[PDB]
A paper describes a structure:
Bacillus cereus (Bc) encodes three FNR paralogs, two of which have assigned distinct biological functions in bacillithiol disulfide reduction and flavodoxin (Fld) reduction. In this study, we have assigned a function to FNR1, in which the His residue is replaced by a conserved Val, in the reduction of the heme-degrading monooxygenase IsdG, ultimately facilitating the release of iron in an important iron acquisition pathway. The Bc IsdG structure was solved, and IsdG-FNR1 interactions were proposed through protein–protein docking.
The IsdG monomers consist of Fd-like α/β-sandwich folds forming a β-barrel at the dimeric interface containing the conserved Asn-Trp-His triad required for the catalytic activity in the heme binding pockets. Bc IsdG was crystallized in its apo-form and reconstituted with hemin, the latter yielding red-brownish crystals. The reaction between FNR1 and IsdG proceeds with a kcat of 2.6 ± 0.2 min−1, the KM of FNR1 for IsdG was determined to be 2.1 ± 0.4 μM, and the catalytic efficiency (kcat/KM) was 1.2 ± 0.2 μM−1min−1. As we have demonstrated that FNR1 can reduce IsdG, the putative interaction was investigated through protein–protein docking. The selected top hits with the shortest heme-Fe (IsdG) to FAD-N5 (FNR) distances cover a large potential binding area of FNR1. In contrast to our previous docking results for Fld to FNR1 and FNR2, it seems likely that IsdG can bind in the less exposed binding cleft found in the FNR1 structure, which is narrower than the more “open” conformation observed in the FNR2 structure, with the latter suggested to facilitate binding of Fld. The docking of IsdG to multiple FNR1 sites, spreading across the binding site in a fan-like distribution, is in accordance with the interaction between cytochromes and methylamine dehydrogenase, where only an approximate orientation was needed for electron transfer.
Numbering used by the authors:
A (entry chain A), B (entry chain B): 1 to 106
């Protein structure tokens, strides 16, 4: 299982703009091996906003299949390029090593 | 929903030691409002290992309850210190803004 994160440093007060663009049903959630997408807003960022888009996959080749897909070309098409309010964008890959679920389900 | 992360930079080749310490049933899983813990290893870090412990909570008050609990206190009773391979540690808090679950492509 892997997580892929896209972390955007954003001009203060503009984080909501990037959140809005992901706050809809899309195509990535129809991809094989997709396990979920979440958008996070970092707390206590003083002079900037920080928005993280993270997707979880059963394996890296499942993510790679999406990035080569047709739907990936449409979802990254009429996007107005990199907006003015994005100061930096970092992508990272993570291996999931341990998962510990609550007792309220176990 | 919030996520609390603790990200440790660790001497390259020693990341497995922190992961192993979290690879067991603990007490945070018994806390009300707890939604899950995972341990991540960042891919393609050159000079160090990076291990992230993530806990997910229904609300910030649930995490606060945990940090006030006798369990949390006992789990940090150690007055000794820190293993020499732990180089840095940063805590971050996140508000979950969007969750997109898998959908059938039909």
């Amino acid at each position: 299982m892997i997580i892929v994160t896209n972390t955007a440093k954003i001009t203060k007060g503009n984080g909501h703009k990037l959140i809005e663009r992901f706050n809809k049903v899309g195509k990535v959630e129809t991809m094989p091996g997709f396990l979920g997408l979440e958008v996070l807003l970092t707390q206590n960022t003083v002079d900037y906003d920080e928005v993280t888009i993270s997707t979880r996959w059963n394996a890296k080749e499942d993510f790679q299949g999406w990035t080569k897909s047709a739907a990936f070309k449409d979802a990254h098409s009429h996007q107005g390029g990199m907006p003015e309010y994005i100061l930096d964008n970092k992508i990272a890959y993570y291996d999931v090593k341990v998962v510990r679920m609550p007792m309220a389900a176990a």
